[PDB]
């Protein structure tokens, strides 16, 4: 069950696309189409939050030292070498790189392919 997730990247949507890119001697524009190049098997452990297996090591990133009091719902983050989408507005220090509408849609074993979209969408 492929699920094409449309996400705006960086700017207000992705507060940490510069850090993610920075850390890995890369550009925000390079980070986007690396992430979008991916093919992600959805998994979970222990939530109902859709962890996404398959991310490129070239865009790995450490979790923000101090947690945010609230990541917005629909955010799209990277923690370590794990990517994934936020169904509801939780707190956490995942490096936020983008945002979709509007997810439970993703269930264990699904396949996620992110596609960019304009701010105007």
CSV table of N, CA and C in Angstrom, one decimal:
chain,number,residue,atom,x,y,z
A,1,UNK,N,0.8,-1.2,0.0
A,1,UNK,CA,0.0,0.0,0.0
A,1,UNK,C,0.9,1.3,0.0
A,2,UNK,N,1.3,1.7,-1.2
A,2,UNK,CA,2.0,3.0,-1.3
A,2,UNK,C,1.2,4.2,-0.9
A,3,UNK,N,1.8,5.1,-0.2
A,3,UNK,CA,1.1,6.3,0.2
A,3,UNK,C,2.0,7.6,-0.1
A,4,UNK,N,1.6,8.3,-1.1
A,4,UNK,CA,2.4,9.5,-1.6
A,4,UNK,C,2.1,10.7,-0.7
A,5,UNK,N,3.1,10.9,0.2
A,5,UNK,CA,3.0,12.1,1.1
A,5,UNK,C,3.5,13.4,0.5
A,6,UNK,N,2.6,14.4,0.4
A,6,UNK,CA,3.1,15.7,-0.2
A,6,UNK,C,3.6,16.6,1.0
A,7,UNK,N,4.8,17.0,0.9
A,7,UNK,CA,5.3,17.9,2.0
A,7,UNK,C,6.1,19.1,1.5
A,8,UNK,N,5.7,20.3,2.0
A,8,UNK,CA,6.5,21.5,1.8
A,8,UNK,C,7.8,21.3,2.7
A,9,UNK,N,8.9,21.7,2.1
A,9,UNK,CA,10.2,21.6,2.8
A,9,UNK,C,10.9,22.9,3.3
A,10,UNK,N,11.4,22.9,4.5
A,10,UNK,CA,12.2,24.1,4.9
A,10,UNK,C,11.3,25.3,5.2
A,11,UNK,N,12.0,26.4,5.4
A,11,UNK,CA,11.3,27.7,5.7
A,11,UNK,C,10.6,27.6,7.1
A,12,UNK,N,9.4,28.2,7.2
A,12,UNK,CA,8.7,28.0,8.5
A,12,UNK,C,8.2,26.6,8.7
A,13,UNK,N,8.1,25.8,7.7
A,13,UNK,CA,7.6,24.4,7.8
A,13,UNK,C,8.7,23.6,8.4
A,14,UNK,N,10.0,23.7,7.9
A,14,UNK,CA,11.1,23.0,8.3
A,14,UNK,C,12.2,23.8,9.0
A,15,UNK,N,11.9,24.2,10.2
A,15,UNK,CA,12.9,25.0,11.1
A,15,UNK,C,14.4,24.5,11.0
A,16,UNK,N,14.6,23.2,10.8
A,16,UNK,CA,16.0,22.7,10.9
A,16,UNK,C,16.5,22.0,9.6
A,17,UNK,N,16.0,22.5,8.4
A,17,UNK,CA,16.6,22.0,7.1
A,17,UNK,C,18.0,22.6,7.0
A,18,UNK,N,18.3,23.8,7.5
A,18,UNK,CA,19.6,24.3,7.5
A,18,UNK,C,20.6,23.5,8.3
A,19,UNK,N,20.2,23.1,9.5
A,19,UNK,CA,21.0,22.3,10.4
A,19,UNK,C,21.3,21.0,9.8
A,20,UNK,N,20.2,20.3,9.4
A,20,UNK,CA,20.3,19.0,8.8
A,20,UNK,C,21.3,19.0,7.6
A,21,UNK,N,21.1,19.9,6.7
A,21,UNK,CA,22.0,20.2,5.6
A,21,UNK,C,23.4,20.6,6.0
A,22,UNK,N,23.5,21.5,6.9
A,22,UNK,CA,24.7,22.0,7.5
A,22,UNK,C,25.6,20.9,8.0
A,23,UNK,N,25.1,20.2,9.1
A,23,UNK,CA,25.8,19.1,9.6
A,23,UNK,C,26.5,18.2,8.6
A,24,UNK,N,25.7,17.7,7.6
A,24,UNK,CA,26.2,16.7,6.6
A,24,UNK,C,26.7,17.4,5.4
A,25,UNK,N,27.6,18.5,5.6
A,25,UNK,CA,28.2,19.2,4.5
A,25,UNK,C,27.4,19.3,3.2
A,26,UNK,N,26.1,19.7,3.3
A,26,UNK,CA,25.1,19.7,2.2
A,26,UNK,C,24.2,20.9,2.2
A,27,UNK,N,23.5,21.1,1.1
A,27,UNK,CA,22.6,22.2,1.0
A,27,UNK,C,21.1,21.8,1.4
A,28,UNK,N,20.3,22.8,1.9
A,28,UNK,CA,18.9,22.5,2.1
A,28,UNK,C,18.2,21.9,0.8
A,29,UNK,N,18.6,22.4,-0.3
A,29,UNK,CA,18.1,22.0,-1.6
A,29,UNK,C,18.5,20.6,-1.9
A,30,UNK,N,19.7,20.2,-1.5
A,30,UNK,CA,20.2,18.8,-1.7
A,30,UNK,C,19.6,17.9,-0.7
A,31,UNK,N,19.4,18.3,0.5
A,31,UNK,CA,18.7,17.5,1.5
A,31,UNK,C,17.3,17.2,1.1
A,32,UNK,N,16.6,18.1,0.5
A,32,UNK,CA,15.2,17.8,0.1
A,32,UNK,C,15.1,16.6,-0.8
A,33,UNK,N,15.8,16.7,-2.0
A,33,UNK,CA,15.7,15.6,-3.0
A,33,UNK,C,16.5,14.3,-2.6
A,34,UNK,N,17.2,14.4,-1.5
A,34,UNK,CA,17.8,13.1,-1.0
A,34,UNK,C,16.6,12.4,-0.2
A,35,UNK,N,15.9,13.1,0.6
A,35,UNK,CA,14.8,12.7,1.4
A,35,UNK,C,13.7,12.1,0.4
A,36,UNK,N,13.4,12.9,-0.6
A,36,UNK,CA,12.4,12.6,-1.6
A,36,UNK,C,12.8,11.4,-2.5
A,37,UNK,N,14.1,11.2,-2.6
A,37,UNK,CA,14.7,10.0,-3.3
A,37,UNK,C,14.4,8.7,-2.6
A,38,UNK,N,14.0,8.8,-1.3
A,38,UNK,CA,13.9,7.6,-0.5
A,38,UNK,C,12.6,6.8,-0.7
A,39,UNK,N,12.6,5.6,-0.1
A,39,UNK,CA,11.5,4.7,-0.2
A,39,UNK,C,11.4,4.0,1.2
A,40,UNK,N,10.3,4.4,1.9
A,40,UNK,CA,10.3,4.2,3.3
A,40,UNK,C,9.3,3.1,3.8
A,41,UNK,N,9.8,2.1,4.4
A,41,UNK,CA,8.8,1.1,5.0
A,41,UNK,C,8.4,1.7,6.4
A,42,UNK,N,7.1,1.8,6.6
A,42,UNK,CA,6.5,2.3,7.8
A,42,UNK,C,6.6,1.3,8.9
A,43,UNK,N,7.1,1.6,10.1
A,43,UNK,CA,7.0,0.7,11.3
A,43,UNK,C,6.7,1.5,12.5
A,44,UNK,N,6.5,0.8,13.7
A,44,UNK,CA,6.2,1.4,15.0
A,44,UNK,C,6.9,0.6,16.0
A,45,UNK,N,7.0,1.1,17.3
A,45,UNK,CA,7.4,0.3,18.4
A,45,UNK,C,6.8,0.8,19.7
A,46,UNK,N,6.6,-0.2,20.7
A,46,UNK,CA,6.3,0.1,22.0
A,46,UNK,C,4.9,0.8,22.2
A,47,UNK,N,2.9,3.8,20.9
A,47,UNK,CA,2.5,5.1,20.3
A,47,UNK,C,1.3,5.1,19.4
A,48,UNK,N,1.5,4.6,18.1
A,48,UNK,CA,0.6,4.9,17.0
A,48,UNK,C,1.2,6.0,16.2
A,49,UNK,N,2.5,6.2,16.3
A,49,UNK,CA,3.3,7.2,15.6
A,49,UNK,C,4.1,6.4,14.5
A,50,UNK,N,4.2,7.0,13.2
A,50,UNK,CA,4.6,6.2,12.1
A,50,UNK,C,6.1,6.4,11.8
A,51,UNK,N,6.9,5.6,12.5
A,51,UNK,CA,8.3,5.6,12.3
A,51,UNK,C,8.6,5.1,10.8
A,52,UNK,N,9.6,5.7,10.1
A,52,UNK,CA,9.8,5.4,8.7
A,52,UNK,C,11.2,4.9,8.5
A,53,UNK,N,11.3,3.6,8.2
A,53,UNK,CA,12.6,2.9,8.0
A,53,UNK,C,13.0,3.2,6.5
A,54,UNK,N,14.3,3.3,6.3
A,54,UNK,CA,14.8,3.4,4.9
A,54,UNK,C,15.7,4.6,4.6
A,55,UNK,N,15.8,5.6,5.6
A,55,UNK,CA,16.4,6.9,5.3
A,55,UNK,C,17.9,6.7,5.0
A,56,UNK,N,18.4,7.6,4.1
A,56,UNK,CA,19.8,7.8,3.7
A,56,UNK,C,20.6,8.3,4.8
A,57,UNK,N,21.7,7.6,5.1
A,57,UNK,CA,22.7,8.0,6.1
A,57,UNK,C,23.3,9.4,5.7
A,58,UNK,N,23.3,9.8,4.5
A,58,UNK,CA,23.9,11.1,4.1
A,58,UNK,C,23.0,12.3,4.6
A,59,UNK,N,21.8,12.0,5.1
A,59,UNK,CA,21.0,13.0,5.7
A,59,UNK,C,20.7,12.7,7.2
A,60,UNK,N,21.4,11.8,7.8
A,60,UNK,CA,21.3,11.5,9.2
A,60,UNK,C,21.5,12.8,10.0
A,61,UNK,N,20.9,12.9,11.2
A,61,UNK,CA,21.0,14.1,12.0
A,61,UNK,C,20.7,13.7,13.4
A,62,UNK,N,21.4,14.4,14.4
A,62,UNK,CA,21.1,14.1,15.8
A,62,UNK,C,19.9,14.9,16.3
A,63,UNK,N,19.2,14.4,17.3
A,63,UNK,CA,18.0,15.0,17.8
A,63,UNK,C,18.4,16.3,18.6
A,64,UNK,N,17.7,17.4,18.4
A,64,UNK,CA,17.9,18.6,19.1
A,64,UNK,C,18.1,18.3,20.6
A,65,UNK,N,19.2,18.9,21.1
A,65,UNK,CA,19.6,18.8,22.5
A,65,UNK,C,18.5,18.9,23.6
A,66,UNK,N,17.7,20.0,23.4
A,66,UNK,CA,16.5,20.2,24.2
A,66,UNK,C,15.2,20.0,23.4
A,67,UNK,N,14.3,19.2,24.0
A,67,UNK,CA,13.0,19.0,23.3
A,67,UNK,C,12.2,20.3,23.1
A,68,UNK,N,11.5,20.4,21.9
A,68,UNK,CA,10.5,21.4,21.7
A,68,UNK,C,9.3,21.1,22.6
A,69,UNK,N,8.6,22.1,23.2
A,69,UNK,CA,7.4,21.9,23.9
A,69,UNK,C,6.2,21.4,23.0
A,70,UNK,N,6.4,21.7,21.7
A,70,UNK,CA,5.4,21.2,20.7
A,70,UNK,C,5.8,21.3,19.2
A,71,UNK,N,6.0,20.2,18.6
A,71,UNK,CA,6.1,20.1,17.2
A,71,UNK,C,4.7,20.1,16.6
A,72,UNK,N,4.5,20.8,15.6
A,72,UNK,CA,3.1,20.8,15.0
A,72,UNK,C,2.8,19.5,14.3
A,73,UNK,N,1.5,19.1,14.4
A,73,UNK,CA,1.0,18.0,13.6
A,73,UNK,C,1.3,18.1,12.2
A,74,UNK,N,1.6,17.0,11.5
A,74,UNK,CA,2.0,17.0,10.1
A,74,UNK,C,3.4,17.3,9.8
A,75,UNK,N,4.2,17.6,10.9
A,75,UNK,CA,5.6,17.9,10.7
A,75,UNK,C,6.3,16.6,10.1
A,76,UNK,N,7.5,16.8,9.6
A,76,UNK,CA,8.2,15.7,9.0
A,76,UNK,C,9.7,15.8,9.5
A,77,UNK,N,10.1,14.8,10.3
A,77,UNK,CA,11.4,15.0,11.0
A,77,UNK,C,12.4,13.9,10.8
A,78,UNK,N,13.6,14.1,11.2
A,78,UNK,CA,14.7,13.2,11.2
A,78,UNK,C,15.3,13.1,12.6
A,79,UNK,N,15.4,11.9,13.2
A,79,UNK,CA,16.1,11.7,14.4
A,79,UNK,C,17.1,10.6,14.2
A,80,UNK,N,18.4,11.0,14.1
A,80,UNK,CA,19.4,10.0,13.9
A,80,UNK,C,19.5,9.6,12.5
A,81,UNK,N,19.2,8.3,12.2
A,81,UNK,CA,19.1,7.8,10.8
A,81,UNK,C,17.6,7.3,10.7
A,82,UNK,N,16.7,7.9,11.4
A,82,UNK,CA,15.3,7.6,11.4
A,82,UNK,C,14.5,8.8,10.9
A,83,UNK,N,13.7,8.7,9.9
A,83,UNK,CA,12.8,9.8,9.5
A,83,UNK,C,11.4,9.4,9.9
A,84,UNK,N,10.4,10.3,9.6
A,84,UNK,CA,9.0,10.0,10.0
A,84,UNK,C,8.1,11.3,10.2
A,85,UNK,N,6.8,11.0,10.1
A,85,UNK,CA,5.8,12.1,10.1
A,85,UNK,C,5.1,12.1,11.5
A,86,UNK,N,4.6,13.3,11.9
A,86,UNK,CA,3.9,13.5,13.1
A,86,UNK,C,2.4,13.6,12.9
A,87,UNK,N,1.6,12.5,13.3
A,87,UNK,CA,0.2,12.6,13.2
A,87,UNK,C,-0.5,13.7,14.1
A,88,UNK,N,-0.1,13.8,15.4
A,88,UNK,CA,-0.6,14.8,16.2
A,88,UNK,C,0.5,15.6,16.8
A,89,UNK,N,0.2,16.9,17.2
A,89,UNK,CA,1.2,17.8,17.7
A,89,UNK,C,1.8,17.3,19.1
A,90,UNK,N,2.9,16.6,19.0
A,90,UNK,CA,3.6,16.2,20.2
A,90,UNK,C,4.8,17.1,20.4
A,91,UNK,N,5.4,17.1,21.6
A,91,UNK,CA,6.8,17.7,21.8
A,91,UNK,C,7.9,16.7,21.4
A,92,UNK,N,9.1,17.3,21.1
A,92,UNK,CA,10.2,16.5,20.8
A,92,UNK,C,11.3,17.2,20.0
A,93,UNK,N,12.6,16.8,20.2
A,93,UNK,CA,13.7,17.3,19.5
A,93,UNK,C,14.1,16.6,18.3
A,94,UNK,N,13.1,16.3,17.4
A,94,UNK,CA,13.4,15.7,16.1
A,94,UNK,C,13.7,16.9,15.2
A,95,UNK,N,14.7,16.8,14.3
A,95,UNK,CA,15.0,17.9,13.4
A,95,UNK,C,13.9,18.1,12.4
A,96,UNK,N,13.1,19.1,12.5
A,96,UNK,CA,11.9,19.3,11.6
A,96,UNK,C,12.3,19.9,10.3
A,97,UNK,N,12.1,19.1,9.2
A,97,UNK,CA,12.5,19.5,7.9
A,97,UNK,C,11.3,19.9,6.9
A,98,UNK,N,10.1,19.5,7.3
A,98,UNK,CA,9.0,19.8,6.4
A,98,UNK,C,7.6,19.6,7.0
A,99,UNK,N,6.5,19.6,6.2
A,99,UNK,CA,5.2,19.4,6.7
A,99,UNK,C,4.2,18.9,5.6
A,100,UNK,N,3.3,18.0,6.0
A,100,UNK,CA,2.2,17.6,5.1
A,100,UNK,C,0.8,18.0,5.6
A,101,UNK,N,-0.2,17.9,4.8
A,101,UNK,CA,-1.6,17.4,5.2
A,101,UNK,C,-1.8,15.9,4.7
A,102,UNK,N,-2.4,15.1,5.5
A,102,UNK,CA,-3.1,15.4,6.8
A,102,UNK,C,-3.5,14.1,7.5
A,103,UNK,N,-2.6,13.5,8.2
A,103,UNK,CA,-2.7,12.0,8.5
A,103,UNK,C,-3.5,11.7,9.8
A,104,UNK,N,-5.7,6.1,11.8
A,104,UNK,CA,-4.3,6.2,11.3
A,104,UNK,C,-4.1,5.8,9.8
A,105,UNK,N,-3.6,6.8,9.0
A,105,UNK,CA,-3.5,6.5,7.6
A,105,UNK,C,-2.3,5.5,7.4
A,106,UNK,N,-1.2,5.8,8.0
A,106,UNK,CA,0.0,4.9,7.8
A,106,UNK,C,-0.1,3.8,8.8
A,107,UNK,N,0.0,2.6,8.3
A,107,UNK,CA,0.0,1.4,9.2
A,107,UNK,C,1.2,0.6,8.9
A,108,UNK,N,1.8,-0.1,9.9
A,108,UNK,CA,2.9,-1.0,9.7
A,108,UNK,C,3.0,-1.7,8.4
A,109,UNK,N,4.1,-1.5,7.7
A,109,UNK,CA,4.4,-2.2,6.4
A,109,UNK,C,4.0,-1.4,5.2
A,110,UNK,N,3.4,-0.2,5.4
A,110,UNK,CA,3.1,0.6,4.2
A,110,UNK,C,4.4,1.1,3.6
A,111,UNK,N,4.3,1.8,2.5
A,111,UNK,CA,5.5,2.4,1.9
A,111,UNK,C,5.2,3.8,1.6
A,112,UNK,N,6.2,4.6,2.0
A,112,UNK,CA,6.0,6.1,1.9
A,112,UNK,C,7.0,6.7,1.0
A,113,UNK,N,6.5,7.5,0.1
A,113,UNK,CA,7.2,8.2,-0.9
A,113,UNK,C,6.8,9.7,-0.7
A,114,UNK,N,7.7,10.5,-0.3
A,114,UNK,CA,7.4,11.9,-0.1
A,114,UNK,C,7.5,12.6,-1.4
A,115,UNK,N,6.6,13.6,-1.6
A,115,UNK,CA,6.6,14.4,-2.8
A,115,UNK,C,6.5,15.9,-2.4
A,116,UNK,N,7.4,16.7,-2.9
A,116,UNK,CA,7.4,18.2,-2.5
A,116,UNK,C,6.1,18.8,-3.0
A,117,UNK,N,5.7,19.9,-2.4
A,117,UNK,CA,4.6,20.8,-2.8
A,117,UNK,C,4.9,22.2,-2.5
A,118,UNK,N,4.2,23.2,-3.2
A,118,UNK,CA,4.4,24.6,-3.0
A,118,UNK,C,3.9,25.0,-1.6
A,119,UNK,N,4.3,26.2,-1.1
A,119,UNK,CA,3.6,26.8,0.0
A,119,UNK,C,2.2,27.1,-0.3
A,120,UNK,N,2.0,27.4,-1.6
A,120,UNK,CA,0.6,27.7,-2.1
A,120,UNK,C,-0.3,26.5,-2.1
A,121,UNK,N,0.1,25.3,-1.8
A,121,UNK,CA,-0.7,24.1,-1.5
A,121,UNK,C,-0.8,23.8,0.0
